[PDB]
């Protein structure tokens, strides 16, 4: 009962999934072959939500892997828990986007999508009652953006009554991978406004910061980042997969943290984050967990949260905790920061508690916030777009796929409007 | 001969209920198996030869909270016909529970209720545990309540509701939920008792000396209170207070039927040795502002009526004295039209204590359910909270999506406002 | 039937009180556990079956001195409801105790007091131990005293205060503290007894033959004196002196209610064998300038009234003779308007002795509480001390910081000055 099939796209998204899946397997106790070796009985009662029980007791991941080139699918098979995945579910093309959303969304992706649109249906049929789809991709390039975007809107025609999650990675100003980020972002966001129910905007610039100072890691890699990001995902859907004193599923969360139709972009956060040095000396108790969580530099979105107010705020705690300890801390925080919470929505807090913790750690906190400080993330992008679009630069790649210069300004306008919605209520 | 049907709605109801059941089991000397190695006839029906099944119905829209009971120690006490389970949850929404999802499950349960209700002969009244702030506990309850007036009507109903706190509350959309669900409560429910978690927490901290409480400590506390209502039925004291009698006593008007509870003494195992528990002291404890179950102010309030229920080692000789003393005091005060305002109950049976319990084993115990103007002020701030939320159409679109028309909100707020003045009118 | 409520304020009060409690326990044959293997009903209430809890309230703004009791031998005698604890200390300041910090703690304690006070039926009067020079013992006491006149008023109060010495004093700002706290003492307190550490020290050295005394030796001494006040209540002698009676006797005017104590005999274990303790000798000992509890001069002073309280082996036949002899002597002298000036009490019960005690086990003992013009001269030098300190605004800024207005000082000094002349007026 209550199943969620997972979708993946892009070079980064796929990688994230690869780690995320592994982590989830570890949490339940699934091995590379698929046979169960775990001891705790409650891992097997909600195994059905993320694993179909196949023949011979070998569980399989309910997933769809998409790409416009075959390069990334090579390393996913050879790595750990690549053998658990079903051969049928891998989808891939021979062309590739080439860091262009125009090629990705119309010409290249629309030929590949019809295979996936048939594959997902089967998955849907398989489970008793599907409650929502998780989606993992990037907005920086053309492959993860153009394909995923194309897909997500066509799901709303067949399944209008289901919740829609999207785990994205938006561009940073300092750590700029590609040149045409402003373009891709500007166009890819447009469709994610009306079609999605919730979106987690992650940024690598913040991740790096988190890594250098807090974890004290001398040589970070993308692997670390993947591990981090996956943790957040694990956190949000913990209440479904395990019992608890106060359970909070996805729909509930959505209802609580999305007050208005067009303002649903969130910012993830994770705690506790401890190095080898801070593992010994940091006293892991609820208050400690709390304070760390609300720090500006501990966020995964590279902004200044204290420029504006949080519209809503929710948290998902794990491991056994006393509720007077838990529920008081939030209140205290609110009291402290009376200038950093919206006044006309009194009592902004939402809490959730799980009995089964992460293996090794005693407690954990996943922070999902909704703020007016997302303006800083978009504003810069808008500016960049303006700078680019003024001289019609890098345009012949997009215009070659049959896109008018008006069609840029149509999405641009929408983006602007969206941005304004935050500054309406700030 | 006498009988009563318990109902449990939402997660909260389920959670509360388990503890209560455990307490009941402890009381009558029944292990989880259901075979005892009379008084218990009310809540337990003896099936064939030595199988005690409870008068119970657990409703929930998730499987998680109900399957917690099916896998635990009390697997043997219930069977799948009693335990009803949905698919899609209420999702902390009134509109999801009442209109969309509520049509399918209620039908299943009504038949079940009938099957349980027609089996027993001496129906005293119903008990319905839920929360106002909860999704299932608001949307389904309202529906359920509406349904129950068709089949029965005059047969009595009670509900022990978890009232939301202004400070320590664990959900954002709670204001809305309360306002809507109180529309059905005024027409249908005969008398609803109200408890606030924040109030409980303070009590847990100060008196019990446990600075790390969780829901399991509150549940236990609640269960004792619940027992103290039904203790008059199941045991034969010198003087008795039935449910109908209680209703007659405590509830004066058609609009007002919202008394609040209190329980004393509640103290640690080490504190029991020093503290000489007298009757007068315990009486006082019920009237203290510190020991109240709701965030309220007895200093501003005036008690119209309040029903004391003693269990353990008590006799009427000093009870009278206690009563007199309270009357004499002017810190406690009543409304002009009610000269005599108490209803006094006694019981020989001592209140039991749970294995590994936070509460100490005591001789005496008290439970006062007071109807008052103190709780009238509690909704004035709720309304304010609600109003602000509504003023800019916050969280409204979700509700609209589930088939809630815009006039519903208008209906529920205005009514609430009207109600707030009623108390004032009565107390002038 | 009879009852009395003890209060302990500040560190000094706590420290004194423990010894007293111990003494009491010794008297009635009660180990620290609180179960005895009647007379004791006054100070101890029997909880349930064999648990004797004291009539007590310890106030302190630090945790250190109160947690000393909680960890020691008498952990079993008290429970955390009786023992109140602050956070920030008085810091040897009157202004910190009364205005800033005093609002929060007093509230907690008043309720507690009520709970204790309403439990007992025969309230004789209150006892309040503190020091004038102490921070908590001045600022809180004044507040507390003020509070207690609202709830009770006519019900009697006593306080055994540690008066500051002109020579041997262990704090710099003591002068200020005394002057302020005496403003509340004149209006509220019915009769306050005064003891000086320096005086005690001399006694300890000369008579007990222990040249290395610490507070524990003084505390014990004090406790005996305290007992000698309350010994008339708890035991049935041939003639009795209740607290009200004492008040009636010793205190003549509204302004003057400051008698001073004295205790005899106090001698070593080896000295008891040689020294034949006669009645006359012990009587004399109370009137000697060497054995007085305050730094004063009986040669300059005149006794208006003084209440003798004998316990042990005494009969009235030689008591009368003793009384006569003193009257006959002219070294001791009285005021013209009082021809008969004694109040004489007797008790059969001998005064007990503590395990490993400095005092010897004796048959007889005496305690004279004398109202006199000798103590009038004691504040003349205090005033001088105070005045100099004030003259250049020394230590004033701290006080100002805590919310003390400048006119307060003016009020307290002038009043004191006025009072000094009253004695003179009376004695002319
Ligand atoms: N957290 C991680 N972020 C990554 C990783 N690899 C890339 N990135 C970030 O994502 C951005 C690039 O995303 P993609 O390579 O998936 C662009 P896309 O696949 O949609 O198009 P093509 O690369 O043309 O196929 C870039 O700004 C990086 O900062 C990774 O392994 N982990
Ligand atoms: N005293 C007490 N209160 C509880 C308990 N569980 C939940 N609550 C309160 O009830 C509210 C949440 O309601 P739930 O019962 O979880 O909601 P629901 O009606 O089951 O709806 P869903 O959660 O969507 O199924 C919160 O405000 C909690 O404070 C409990 O065990 N004891
Ligand atoms: N006889 C006697 N005097 C004491 C004792 N303890 C303190 N004193 C005297 O009391 C004065 C100090 O007062 P404290 O009681 O320490 O002060 P306080 O009122 O507790 O205020 P804080 O110390 O700030 O909490 C000094 O002048 C001491 O001589 C004791 O055990 N016996
Ligand atoms: Mg790629
Ligand atoms: Mg629930
Ligand atoms: Mg001190």
PDB file of N, CA and C in Angstrom, chain C residues 2-6 21 24 28 39-45 53-56 127 226 230 233-234:
ATOM      1  N   UNK C   2      -1.987  22.147  69.101  1.00  0.00           N
ATOM      2  CA  UNK C   2      -1.147  23.323  68.828  1.00  0.00           C
ATOM      3  C   UNK C   2      -0.117  23.061  67.721  1.00  0.00           C
ATOM      4  N   UNK C   3       0.265  24.133  67.029  1.00  0.00           N
ATOM      5  CA  UNK C   3       1.103  24.060  65.830  1.00  0.00           C
ATOM      6  C   UNK C   3       1.868  25.365  65.609  1.00  0.00           C
ATOM      7  N   UNK C   4       3.023  25.281  64.950  1.00  0.00           N
ATOM      8  CA  UNK C   4       3.789  26.475  64.567  1.00  0.00           C
ATOM      9  C   UNK C   4       4.613  26.234  63.299  1.00  0.00           C
ATOM     10  N   UNK C   5       4.700  27.267  62.462  1.00  0.00           N
ATOM     11  CA  UNK C   5       5.330  27.185  61.146  1.00  0.00           C
ATOM     12  C   UNK C   5       6.702  27.849  61.203  1.00  0.00           C
ATOM     13  N   UNK C   6       7.755  27.093  60.884  1.00  0.00           N
ATOM     14  CA  UNK C   6       9.118  27.635  60.816  1.00  0.00           C
ATOM     15  C   UNK C   6       9.452  28.067  59.389  1.00  0.00           C
ATOM     16  N   UNK C  21      16.905  21.419  63.691  1.00  0.00           N
ATOM     17  CA  UNK C  21      16.150  20.249  63.232  1.00  0.00           C
ATOM     18  C   UNK C  21      16.706  18.983  63.864  1.00  0.00           C
ATOM     19  N   UNK C  24      15.849  18.750  67.475  1.00  0.00           N
ATOM     20  CA  UNK C  24      14.434  18.378  67.584  1.00  0.00           C
ATOM     21  C   UNK C  24      14.277  16.870  67.435  1.00  0.00           C
ATOM     22  N   UNK C  28      12.816  13.926  70.312  1.00  0.00           N
ATOM     23  CA  UNK C  28      11.646  13.039  70.222  1.00  0.00           C
ATOM     24  C   UNK C  28      11.969  11.594  69.808  1.00  0.00           C
ATOM     25  N   UNK C  39       3.564  14.639  72.039  1.00  0.00           N
ATOM     26  CA  UNK C  39       4.322  15.881  72.243  1.00  0.00           C
ATOM     27  C   UNK C  39       4.861  16.491  70.943  1.00  0.00           C
ATOM     28  N   UNK C  40       5.382  15.637  70.062  1.00  0.00           N
ATOM     29  CA  UNK C  40       6.001  16.073  68.794  1.00  0.00           C
ATOM     30  C   UNK C  40       5.062  16.650  67.723  1.00  0.00           C
ATOM     31  N   UNK C  41       3.746  16.527  67.914  1.00  0.00           N
ATOM     32  CA  UNK C  41       2.741  16.971  66.928  1.00  0.00           C
ATOM     33  C   UNK C  41       2.895  18.413  66.400  1.00  0.00           C
ATOM     34  N   UNK C  42       3.450  19.308  67.220  1.00  0.00           N
ATOM     35  CA  UNK C  42       3.666  20.711  66.840  1.00  0.00           C
ATOM     36  C   UNK C  42       4.542  20.875  65.587  1.00  0.00           C
ATOM     37  N   UNK C  43       5.790  20.409  65.660  1.00  0.00           N
ATOM     38  CA  UNK C  43       6.759  20.569  64.560  1.00  0.00           C
ATOM     39  C   UNK C  43       6.711  19.459  63.508  1.00  0.00           C
ATOM     40  N   UNK C  44       6.297  18.255  63.909  1.00  0.00           N
ATOM     41  CA  UNK C  44       6.207  17.114  62.997  1.00  0.00           C
ATOM     42  C   UNK C  44       4.757  16.688  62.756  1.00  0.00           C
ATOM     43  N   UNK C  45       4.413  16.480  61.483  1.00  0.00           N
ATOM     44  CA  UNK C  45       3.126  15.905  61.079  1.00  0.00           C
ATOM     45  C   UNK C  45       3.352  14.472  60.605  1.00  0.00           C
ATOM     46  N   UNK C  53       7.372  14.516  58.820  1.00  0.00           N
ATOM     47  CA  UNK C  53       7.889  15.657  58.042  1.00  0.00           C
ATOM     48  C   UNK C  53       7.811  16.948  58.869  1.00  0.00           C
ATOM     49  N   UNK C  54       8.861  17.795  58.810  1.00  0.00           N
ATOM     50  CA  UNK C  54       8.885  19.016  59.621  1.00  0.00           C
ATOM     51  C   UNK C  54       8.044  20.158  59.054  1.00  0.00           C
ATOM     52  N   UNK C  55       7.564  21.034  59.938  1.00  0.00           N
ATOM     53  CA  UNK C  55       6.933  22.291  59.517  1.00  0.00           C
ATOM     54  C   UNK C  55       8.057  23.257  59.146  1.00  0.00           C
ATOM     55  N   UNK C  56       8.401  23.316  57.860  1.00  0.00           N
ATOM     56  CA  UNK C  56       9.576  24.075  57.420  1.00  0.00           C
ATOM     57  C   UNK C  56       9.485  24.582  55.986  1.00  0.00           C
ATOM     58  N   UNK C 127       8.039  31.571  62.890  1.00  0.00           N
ATOM     59  CA  UNK C 127       9.452  31.758  63.239  1.00  0.00           C
ATOM     60  C   UNK C 127      10.226  32.032  61.945  1.00  0.00           C
ATOM     61  N   UNK C 226      16.737  28.398  71.084  1.00  0.00           N
ATOM     62  CA  UNK C 226      15.490  28.308  70.313  1.00  0.00           C
ATOM     63  C   UNK C 226      14.523  27.340  70.991  1.00  0.00           C
ATOM     64  N   UNK C 230      10.436  27.326  72.723  1.00  0.00           N
ATOM     65  CA  UNK C 230       9.342  26.417  72.355  1.00  0.00           C
ATOM     66  C   UNK C 230       9.123  25.233  73.313  1.00  0.00           C
ATOM     67  N   UNK C 233       5.632  24.751  75.003  1.00  0.00           N
ATOM     68  CA  UNK C 233       4.567  24.182  74.171  1.00  0.00           C
ATOM     69  C   UNK C 233       4.572  22.657  74.217  1.00  0.00           C
ATOM     70  N   UNK C 234       5.710  22.072  73.857  1.00  0.00           N
ATOM     71  CA  UNK C 234       5.807  20.631  73.593  1.00  0.00           C
ATOM     72  C   UNK C 234       5.816  19.729  74.829  1.00  0.00           C
TER      73      UNK C 234
END
